[PDB]
Write a protein that binds this ligand. Structure first.
Ligand SMILES: [Mg+2]
Ligand SMILES: [Mg+2]
Ligand SMILES: [Mg+2]
Ligand SMILES: [Mg+2]
Ligand SMILES: [Mg+2]
Ligand SMILES: [Mg+2]
Ligand SMILES: [Mg+2]
Ligand SMILES: [Mg+2]
Ligand SMILES: [Mg+2]
Ligand SMILES: [Mg+2]
Ligand SMILES: [Mg+2]
Ligand SMILES: [Mg+2]
Ligand SMILES: [Mg+2]
Ligand SMILES: [Mg+2]
Ligand SMILES: [Mg+2]
Ligand SMILES: [Mg+2]
Ligand SMILES: [Mg+2]
Ligand SMILES: [Mg+2]
Lengths: 110, 103, 56, 150, 142, 117
RNA sequence: GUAACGGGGCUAAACCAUGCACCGAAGCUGCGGCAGCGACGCUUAUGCGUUGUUGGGUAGGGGAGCGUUCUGUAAGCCUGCGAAGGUGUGCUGUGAGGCAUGCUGGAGGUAUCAGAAGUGCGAAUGCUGACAUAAGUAACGAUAAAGCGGGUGAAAAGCCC
RNA sequence: CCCGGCGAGGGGAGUGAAAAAGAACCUGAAACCGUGUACGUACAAGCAGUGGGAGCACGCUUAGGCGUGUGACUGCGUACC
């Protein structure tokens, strides 16, 4: 049974979150959670929280039994940018985009 | 055990039972054309037209659906000369089956 | 100095051919407390090689 | 277009592109290269061609026997229901019924009847002559359309 | 009914042995190369390597014509500084003769990837025997 | 009568991007690039229709020669022969018997060799 | 950088002379096809077995058409048994296109013949918006400077003691 | 109701004809970014296609030496205004 959890409007680029996400993909939910705890990227926490929520979602809303779960699917798409300006030298004003992601985790037992 | 014959404006090596696509051919869909000037026949031991066409070799086939090939595009485009035209062309063909090869 | 043509979405890819993080693998469990922990590191509840060190 | 004569930015120098009026038809908001004005689409039509046309269309109505002349077409009071009756009676639904001097009731009837329309002889126009399945017309009126077209 | 294509996976090949000895290099290369390329059969398929494996022999004794032996060009460039080295024909027969015939038929096979493969089929040798007895090379000429 | 424009426009761009599938990067993604990409594909295939006919004949000739030469005659003479051979006409394509009937071929060389004697 | 035969290589695979084969173009021929402009024979609200012939083309002239909005035809016609639009596919047209139909969508669309045009875009350093690139690079704003203990807190180098 | 910081966001439940309407809400194209699968790709040199073309993969019909995708190898080939 699939069962999934996601974080939309995550305040990280995507490129960065993906970096963490690829560590985890297709791992035993257990081994996933470990790889995350000991990864020093702020995305790690962002994605650990999803995995967790997702596992919880599994156990509570469906078959559960977190013993078999795998992160069978994880992919993060890019959310909207918040748009800003950077006062710069000689009156020039620069753009700058604060970027966000939508993290999606899908956990199951098959 | 095959033979060769001029029929498109082109020639074709052919054996009985075998279908070939020729250029168009008035002959109505089901009838039987008879190619009566074959330029070679062969088994294990064979007959070249010492002249053109082997003495009495003929070939028989039944037309078997007429048709138009898959469209193709003609593009002409002359760079910097404000010029180009595109064109579509198809091409009638008739298909014959080959029952003959009367040695 | 600035680029003369936009780089393909492919070159980005290739440039990043090395960006992948490496997962840890190298953590273990304390013989005396639950406690996973990086090799050669204090466990959170404060253990190291059994023997509870660092009382905090 | 509501705006100002001011030139958005210099000619030379900012790496931009000429510009000269925030109202350029090519600029966004504000423009319109050949803005319309209100105009009169009336066309002339020679007299002899108007009369010539009508004749040409009566003749064809007649040739398709869509022209069905009667002596006196009229009704007893201004009641669409009444008319609707006569029509049902005469095998009519799409009709012209151009009468001689026009009564008023028959105009008052017919009004809500949508596939039908009554006119006085001197009224009669090209299209409405064509627009209906049949056009009726009384002897009373033909004498008139006669004179008219000459 | 389209014309035939040799097919890399069904193509035959075959081994041969050629004595370079007195042969006039280049009239020899010319042959090696054409056989090297399959140009003698169902070549009839220029995208497919239909050539035969030919093992050459006694290259050092290859023969030349005119004054070439002492005078034949032979240039090359290391792509460094101003690195253009050159060697005379006899200089080359002197150190690793194999080379003359190789560099020879190479210039005669085509172009790039394919032709480049075709050339691996050719196993030369300066001496008079070779260690490909198992391939059962059949002798030939030109 | 102010005119929408756009559906009839998206019709066209799509028409071109569709002809440009499998083309690389923007060639297959970006109209402005896609177009010039289609047009040349077009021009190449008009050229190459003509070309094809050259290519095969040269394929054929090449292999006629391999075979003729194997039976101890040069392509040139072999053709000449066939030509003199009590008339005796017969496509170069057709002379694929060359591959698929080596005995019918030697036949041909003989007929040819003879009309040359 | 060989670099003054395209290369390999050639003593002929060079020059001269005679000869006969062959290869070779979108030329010429063959088979099928379309059209413009003429004119036979079959026969005219004529198109034809047709038939001779022509069919590179910028500027420019001429001819014939596609499609878009809106008026009428239409209180008709199609449509919640699924309109417009979006996305596939199939067949068709010389083309601009047309028609069908799966998916999506969920309220409108209109044949035909005519009528009118804010009718067709890749380029004007065009206008607006959206989104890429360089790049997870530069940088994070005076080189007066930090260290540790306790705290709160989900988290504390940066707050509080 | 559950994960979470009495968050952000999310999974169920439920309303509804529909949440393939959930408030950034009708339709929801394009550039541009991803996950998944077939095929290709680490001796290969250029407007990236086009002509020929193996192989693999998927559909064929009871084969028939076909359709679709991919595209080793190979001839030709310096974008548009
Ligand atoms: Mg300032
Ligand atoms: Mg305005
Ligand atoms: Mg007047
Ligand atoms: Mg070449
Ligand atoms: Mg000739
Ligand atoms: Mg030709
Ligand atoms: Mg012309
Ligand atoms: Mg011409
Ligand atoms: Mg509309
Ligand atoms: Mg545009
Ligand atoms: Mg232009
Ligand atoms: Mg950094
Ligand atoms: Mg850099
Ligand atoms: Mg740096
Ligand atoms: Mg730095
Ligand atoms: Mg919506
Ligand atoms: Mg390789
Ligand atoms: Mg390269």
């Amino acid at each position: 049974m699939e069962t999934i959890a996601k974080h939309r409007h995550a305040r990280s680029s995507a490129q960065k979150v993906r970096l963490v996400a690829d560590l985890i993909r297709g791992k035993k939910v257990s081994q996933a959670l470990d790889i995350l705890t000991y990864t020093n990227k702020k995305a790690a926490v962002l994605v650990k929280k999803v995995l967790e929520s997702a596992i919880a979602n599994a156990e509570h809303n469906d078959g559960a039994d977190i013993d078999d779960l795998k992160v069978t699917k994880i992919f993060v798409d890019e959310g909207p940018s918040m748009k800003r300006i950077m006062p710069r030298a000689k009156g020039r004003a620069d753009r700058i985009l604060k970027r966000t992601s939508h993290i999606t985790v899908v956990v199951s037992d098959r | 055990m095959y033979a060769v014959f001029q029929s498109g404006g082109k020639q074709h090596r052919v054996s009985e039972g075998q279908t070939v696509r020729l250029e168009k051919l008035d002959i109505a869909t089901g009838e039987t054309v008879e190619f009566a000037e074959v330029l070679m026949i062969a088994n294990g031991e064979e007959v070249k037209i010492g002249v053109p066409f082997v003495d009495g070799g003929v070939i028989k086939a039944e037309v078997v659906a007429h048709g138009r090939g898959e469209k193709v595009k003609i593009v002409k485009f002359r760079r910097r000369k404000h010029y180009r035209k595109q064109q579509g062309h198809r091409q009638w063909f008739t298909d014959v089956k080959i029952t003959g090869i009367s040695a | 100095a600035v680029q003369q043509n936009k780089p393909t979405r492919s070159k980005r890819g290739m440039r990043r051919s090395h960006d992948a993080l490496t997962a840890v693998t190298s953590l273990s469990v304390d013989k005396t407390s639950g406690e996973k922990h990086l090799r050669h590191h204090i466990t959170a509840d404060g253990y190291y090689r059994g023997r509870k060190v660092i009382a905090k | 277009v509501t705006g100002s004569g001011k030139k958005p930015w210099r000619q030379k120098g900012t790496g931009r592109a000429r510009s000269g009026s925030i109202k350029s038809p090519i600029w966004r908001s504000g423009g319109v290269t050949f803005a319309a004005r209100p105009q009169d689409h009336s066309q002339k039509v020679n007299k002899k061609m108007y009369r010539g046309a009508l004749k040409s269309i009566l003749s064809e109505l007649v040739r398709q026997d869509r022209l069905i002349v009667v002596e006196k077409f009229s009704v007893e009071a201004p009641k669409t229901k009444l008319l609707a009756q006569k029509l049902k009676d005469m095998a009519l639904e799409d009709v012209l019924i151009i009468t001689g001097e026009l009564d008023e009731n028959l105009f008052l009837a017919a009004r809500n009847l949508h596939k039908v329309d009554v006119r006085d002889a001197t009224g009669i126009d090209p299209v409405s002559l064509i627009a209906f399945d049949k056009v009726v017309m009384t002897a009373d009126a033909v004498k008139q359309v006669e004179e008219m077209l000459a | 009914m389209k014309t035939f294509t040799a097919k890399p996976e069904t193509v035959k090949r075959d081994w041969y042995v050629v004595d370079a000895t007195g042969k006039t290099l280049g009239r020899l290369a010319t042959e090696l190369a054409r056989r090297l390329r399959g140009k003698h059969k169902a070549e009839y398929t220029p995208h497919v390597d239909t050539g035969d494996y030919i093992i050459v022999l006694n290259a050092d004794k290859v023969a030349v014509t005119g004054n070439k032996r002492t005078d034949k060009v032979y240039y090359h460039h290391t792509g460094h500084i101003g690195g253009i080295k050159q060697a005379t024909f006899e200089e080359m027969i002197a150190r690793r003769p194999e080379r003359v015939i190789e560099i020879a038929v190479k210039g005669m096979l085509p172009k790039g990837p394919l032709g480049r493969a075709m050339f691996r089929k050719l196993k030369v040798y300066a001496g008079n025997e070779h260690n490909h007895a198992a391939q059962q090379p059949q002798v030939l000429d030109i | 009568a102010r005119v929408k424009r756009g559906v009839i426009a998206r019709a066209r761009h799509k028409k071109i991007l569709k002809q440009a599938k499998g083309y690389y990067g923007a060639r297959s993604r970006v109209y402005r690039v896609a177009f010039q990409a289609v047009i040349k594909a077009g021009q190449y295939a008009y050229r190459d229709r003509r070309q094809r006919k050259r290519q095969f004949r040269q394929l054929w000739i090449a292999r006629i020669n391999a075979a003729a030469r194997q039976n101890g005659i040069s392509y040139s003479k072999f053709i000449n022969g066939l030509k003199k051979a009590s008339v005796e006409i017969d496509r170069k394509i057709l002379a694929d018997i060359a591959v698929f009937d080596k005995v019918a071929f030697t036949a041909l060389v003989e007929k040819a060799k003879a009309a040359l004697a």
